[PDB]
């Protein structure tokens, strides 16, 4: 039936055959045959608890999909997740901001400058964010006023838009 | 029955997957070995040995050897070449010819993962495995290496095999908020006369050390009488030398309410509790909070 009806077969066939078996290579191959969206998720769910990095490579191989990968990478530990966002950038800015928030926020200089690059990437809550980052220091009114100036310039480029 | 080529097509495609690098080829070694396991058995093991050795080189020592004992059943010279450090040779000479094929593989595993930061933890697990198989030969090796947090674990284990524990705990505490918590809990658990003696030569007084001396008096002098008078002396000596006494009035109010029950005793407890509240409320704390708030607002602007 080819890639149309075959999917209608294949979703139940996967859910069932995975439910049955004891051996990685056979089912691995079966997903391989299979692959030609949810399939990635079943498959990834398999790899994490039988086959891990390989799975992460598979997820690496849309916003929701980006959100997942990041979750599984966090499951492998924190460090990757900040890394994941950089992949993520290329509404998404809200997510990159969501990752960057605890990134530099827990921190790193490349990450903070990235926070600036993202905040400037495209917003009053973000202004509260940068203001929070400035307030956190016991880092200067000058850079802060320059920041509000740049965001104002963004207000200018935004207002200039038709 | 007739799924033989199912394995042969999958295993050929698994090896057929190109692998540039060390970890990529070692990742493929995990795939085809599992395919070989489920389904020239010696030459596949030999080509697997060269792939793991020809890789990460740091992580292949734990990857290759972990599937060597299973590969051997389906060995002594190959393990010594891969594991190749001074303490590992000392561990081998004590339990190679004396005890095994389980022991001789476990020692090479200990020298692969360590050679470390987890040396006091691994050495404590080595003595627990060697002694079990209340031994005085392995415990003395730990006691000899103690003189040259982690030592309290080996001290509490050797004593269990509180008469001999005082000999080890005195040496441990002689040489960290967690380190003193282990020595304080050991001298308190051993016991009510010696529990108070250990409290006097440790608790001294701190917010944890002062709170520990109060908890020691609750358990040690619980079934005796003079818990209120001794607790009032500790809070007075601590407050004078060292606003943050909300846990002393709260733990004392819960200790009085938790006591099993009269009228004259309960009314006397209300008089004693209210006397501390009246004396506490008239000692500079709602007034102290607003004072620092005005200074904090003034300091900024």
Swiss-Prot record, chain A:
HAT repeats lie at residues 22-49, 76-105, 107-134. Transmembrane segments: none annotated. It comes from the Eukaryota. It is found in: Nucleus. Involved in pre-mRNA splicing and cell cycle control. As a component of the NTC complex (or PRP19-associated complex), associates to the spliceosome to mediate conformational rearrangement or to stabilize the structure of the spliceosome after U4 snRNA dissociation, which leads to spliceosome maturation. Belongs to the NTC complex (or PRP19-associated complex), composed of at least CEF1, CLF1, ISY1, NTC20, SNT309, SYF1, SYF2, and PRP19. Belongs to the crooked-neck family. Present with 2170 molecules/cell in log phase SD medium. This is Pre-mRNA-splicing factor SYF1. It comes from Saccharomyces cerevisiae (strain ATCC 204508 / S288c) (Baker's yeast). The chain holds residues 615 to 819 of 859 of the full protein.
Curated annotation (Swiss-Prot), chain B:
It comes from the Eukaryota. Belongs to the NTC complex (or PRP19-associated complex), composed of at least CEF1, CLF1, ISY1, NTC20, SNT309, SYF1, SYF2, and PRP19. This is Pre-mRNA-splicing factor CLF1. Coiled coil: none annotated. Present with 2140 molecules/cell in log phase SD medium. HAT repeats lie at residues 6-38, 40-68, 78-106, 135-161, 198-224. Involved in pre-mRNA splicing and cell cycle progression. Required for the spliceosome assembly by promoting the functional integration of the U4/U6.U5 tri-snRNP particle into the U1-, U2-dependent pre-spliceosome. Also recruits PRP19 to the spliceosome, as a component of the NTC complex (or PRP19-associated complex). The association of the NTC complex to the spliceosome mediates conformational rearrangement or stabilizes the structure of the spliceosome after U4 snRNA dissociation, which leads to spliceosome maturation. It is found in: Nucleus. Belongs to the crooked-neck family. It comes from Saccharomyces cerevisiae (strain ATCC 204508 / S288c) (Baker's yeast).
């Amino acid at each position: 039936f080819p890639p149309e009806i075959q999917y209608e077969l294949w979703i139940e066939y996967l859910e069932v055959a995975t439910s049955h078996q004891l051996s990685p290579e056979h089912i691995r191959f079966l997903f391989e045959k299979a692959l030609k969206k949810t399939i990635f998720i079943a498959y990834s769910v398999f790899e994490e608890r039988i086959s891990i990095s390989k799975s992460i490579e598979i997820l690496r191989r849309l916003q929701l999909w980006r959100m997942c990968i990041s979750k599984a990478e966090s499951t492998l530990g924190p460090s990757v997740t900040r890394e994941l966002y950089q992949e993520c950038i290329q509404k998404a800015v809200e997510f990159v901001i969501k990752f960057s928030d605890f990134e530099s926020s827990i921190g790193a200089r490349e990450i903070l400058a990235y926070g600036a690059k993202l905040l400037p990437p495209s917003e009053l809550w973000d202004s509260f964010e940068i203001f929070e980052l400035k307030h956190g220091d016991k880092t200067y009114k000058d850079m802060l006023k320059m920041k509000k100036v740049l965001e104002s310039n963004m207000l200018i480029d935004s207002a200039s838009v038709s | 029955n007739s799924i033989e080529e199912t394995i042969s097509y999958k295993r050929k495609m698994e090896y057929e997957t190109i692998l540039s690098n060390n970890a990529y080829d070692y990742d493929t070694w995990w795939l085809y070995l599992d395919l070989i396991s489920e389904s020239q058995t010696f030459e596949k093991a030999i080509v697997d040995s060269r792939p793991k050795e020809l890789s990460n080189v740091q992580w292949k020592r734990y990857i290759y050897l972990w599937m060597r004992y299973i590969c051997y059943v389906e060995n002594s010279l190959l393990e010594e070449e891969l594991f190749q450090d001074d303490i590992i040779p000392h561990k081998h000479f004590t339990f190679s010819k004396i005890w095994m094929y389980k022991f001789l593989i476990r020692h090479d595993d200990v020298p692969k993962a360590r050679k470390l930061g987890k040396a006091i933890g691994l050495c404590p697990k080595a003595k627990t495995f060697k002694g079990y198989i209340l031994k005085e030969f392995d415990r003395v090796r730990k006691i000899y290496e103690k003189f040259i947090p982690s030592d309290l674990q080996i001290w509490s284990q050797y004593g269990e095999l509180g008469d001999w524990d005082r000999v080890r705990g005195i040496y441990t505490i002689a040489l960290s908020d967690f380190l003193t918590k282990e020595a304080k809990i050991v001298l308190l658990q051993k016991y009510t006369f010696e529990t108070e003696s250990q409290e006097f030569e440790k608790a001294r007084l701190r917010r944890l050390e002062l709170n520990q001396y109060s908890p020691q008096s609750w358990i040690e002098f619980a079934m005796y009488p003079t818990e209120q008078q001794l607790l009032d002396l500790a809070k007075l000596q601590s407050e004078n030398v060292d606003e943050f006494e909300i846990t002393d009035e709260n733990k004392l109010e819960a200790r009085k309410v938790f006591e099993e029950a009269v009228f004259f005793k309960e009314k006397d407890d209300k008089q004693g509790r209210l006397s501390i509240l009246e004396a506490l409320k008239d000692y500079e704390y709602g007034t102290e909070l607003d004072q620092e708030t005005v200074k904090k607002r003034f300091p900024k602007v």
